[PDB]
């Protein structure tokens, strides 16, 4: 994995020694070269994972999240370069350095052989994201979110730390490869119940869980575009990756500890999708859509069937691409009308036809139009949860109505109807913006041809 | 009154000073070469050669082998009269059960 970490670190002398008009071009070029390099991780096997060293490994779960992570950096550099034009050059290089450092943390978070190195890199990803959100977020009003981050630290990552140190003392190792063969059944006891909550609640907030999703339509709103792209595309999926690693140790107690949280997600995707029908803020609507889609990944991990893991990792990759494109479309209107109000600028297909085509395609991938991998992930999760319980199809299908309903409403409000009269700064689409939409959508459409590379280790 | 403050800067239009602006930069040569870099190393390099790489992956997770191996083993046990698959994954002779 050291053929990826070292070029990502060499992006730091590349971004600090570059000429002042060249720092976007150079970082975009070399991060696209790293993303082309990232396809060497597709050397996967039907029995063995790709095990590089004592520190790094890659099965077919971590590999597509790595490719999506290394692909997300050039797109963030394209998306965030317009609204940093009047920024200081040194502050602009600090922004690019925090993006590069976040990629550096993520690409060795997903490959972490041992679980406390996963914990260190997992909680290391929060700091450059925090600095990007609070130094370039264009407004900061976080009176209620401070107490929620305190709740995240109390109920989340610290019990995970104590639990992983406990497994280190009990099993003697936290290597996931060793824990594949030295796993003991975790029986019914109160010690094992608090053990399960400690191993799971950090990743429950990171997904997020319904009821615990209070941070996500704030942190998505108060962020720049690169921060919202990396939150929607990668930083939610650390929770799902960590659940799919840590549920190896949590058998068979998961088979009766999943029942509350499954309810919290199965009803929760009914609520948040419905919440998207009453959103004034477009970026908040995409945030609650992200909650409504990660609820299915929570259910699919907690029911731990093969079809559910295949659908959950396909849904993670697909929703990463789709929701990142949705935030980029929301920014491509916000950079013109200077307000996130979804009822402000209407009828935009009269003014921007190709951009409305991109809105249509991102909406159709948002509502899981087949054969897109949004639908493949959605569908396999629905099949596995039907095998879990035959009634849940109702709570699936009703969600699959409301998921359609706000997806086209977001299309109908922003793009259709009568244009707003008093807005006359609606410029034509820059080639940068259309390139950003295409570099989201065309990989998402090409993955419908060959979905087997995004269906996880047990395809 | 309130403090000494610089006023709100108006949103610039990149089409005024450069009607051929792609939106990457306000300097037109930098803008056009940023466009060429994004389009070449994004579309000509990663998407096209990447789809060519993924399409010709050498039996990604040994599926094709596993079909052809099955085409051996069925042919080995249709002909020798065996059942096509045993109900036990391992040999039941080499297994010691707990007695009662």
């Amino acid at each position: 994995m050291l053929k990826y970490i070292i070029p990502t670190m060499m992006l730091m002398p590349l971004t600090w020694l570059s000429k002042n008009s060249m720092i976007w071009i150079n970082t975009t070029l070399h991060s696209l070269l790293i993303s082309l390099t990232s396809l060497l991780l597709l050397n996967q096997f039907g029995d063995n994972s790709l095990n590089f060293s004592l520190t790094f490994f890659s099965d077919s779960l971590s590999t597509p999240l790595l490719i999506l992570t290394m692909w997300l950096l050039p797109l963030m550099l394209m998306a965030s370069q317009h609204h940093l034009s009047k920024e200081n050059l040194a502050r602009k290089k600090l922004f690019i350095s925090m993006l590069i450092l976040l990629q550096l943390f993520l690409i060795m978070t997903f490959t972490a052989t041992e679980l406390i190195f996963f914990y260190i890199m997992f909680e290391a990803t929060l700091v450059p994201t925090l600095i990007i959100i609070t130094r370039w977020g264009n407004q900061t009003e976080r009176l209620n979110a401070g107490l929620y981050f305190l709740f995240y630290t109390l109920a989340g990552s610290l019990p995970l730390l104590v639990a992983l140190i406990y497994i280190q003392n009990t099993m003697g190792s936290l290597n996931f490869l060793i824990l594949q063969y030295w796993v003991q059944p975790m029986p019914n006891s109160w010690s094992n119940t608090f053990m399960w909550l400690a191993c799971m609640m950090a990743f429950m907030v990171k997904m997020p869980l319904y009821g615990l999703h209070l941070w996500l339509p704030k942190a998505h709103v108060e962020a720049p575009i690169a921060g919202s792209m990396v939150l929607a595309a990668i930083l939610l999926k650390l929770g799902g990756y960590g659940m799919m690693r840590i549920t190896l140790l949590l058998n068979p107690i998961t088979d009766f500890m999943a029942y509350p949280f499954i309810m919290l997600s199965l009803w929760g995707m009914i609520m948040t999708s419905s919440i998207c029908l009453r959103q004034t803020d477009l970026k908040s609507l995409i945030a609650y859509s992200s909650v409504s889609h990660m609820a299915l990944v929570i259910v699919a991990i907690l029911i731990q069937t093969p079809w559910s893991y295949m659908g959950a990792t396909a849904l993670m990759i697909a929703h990463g691409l789709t929701s990142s494109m949705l935030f980029c479309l929301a920014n491509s209107n916000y950079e013109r009308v200077h307000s996130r109000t979804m009822i402000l600028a209407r009828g935009l297909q009269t003014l921007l036809p190709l951009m409305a085509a991109w809105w249509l395609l991102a909406s159709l991938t948002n509502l899981a139009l087949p054969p897109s991998i949004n639908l493949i992930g959605e569908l396999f999760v629905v099949m596995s949860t039907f095998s879990w319980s035959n009634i849940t199809i109702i709570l699936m299908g009703l969600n699959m109505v409301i998921t359609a309903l706000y997806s086209l409403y977001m299309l109908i409000t922003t793009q259709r109807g009568k244009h707003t009269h008093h807005i006359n700064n609606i410029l034509p689409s820059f080639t940068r913006e259309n390139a950003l939409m295409s570099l989201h959508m065309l990989p998402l459409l090409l993955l419908s041809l060959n979905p087997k590379i995004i269906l996880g280790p047990l395809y | 009154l309130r403090w000494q403050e610089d006023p709100e800067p108006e949103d610039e239009n990149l089409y005024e000073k450069n009607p051929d602006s792609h939106g990457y930069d306000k300097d037109p040569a930098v803008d056009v070469w940023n466009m060429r870099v994004v389009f070449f190393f994004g579309f000509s390099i990663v998407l096209v050669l990447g789809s060519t790489f993924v399409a010709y992956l050498p039996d990604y997770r040994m599926q094709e082998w596993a079909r052809r191996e099955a085409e051996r083993l069925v042919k080995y046990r249709e002909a020798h009269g065996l059942p096509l698959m045993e109900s036990n994954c391992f040999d039941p002779s080499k297994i010691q059960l707990p007695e009662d």
Binding site: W136, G137, N138, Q139, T140, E141, H338 | E8, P9, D11
Partner: peptide, 19 residues
């Protein structure tokens, strides 16, 4: 349209003896 920063009202909350 630009980025928000502390005003006098935000800054005076950290100038007393106690928080």
């Amino acid at each position: 349209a630009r980025q928000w920063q502390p005003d006098v009202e935000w800054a005076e909350q950290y100038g007393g003896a106690v928080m």
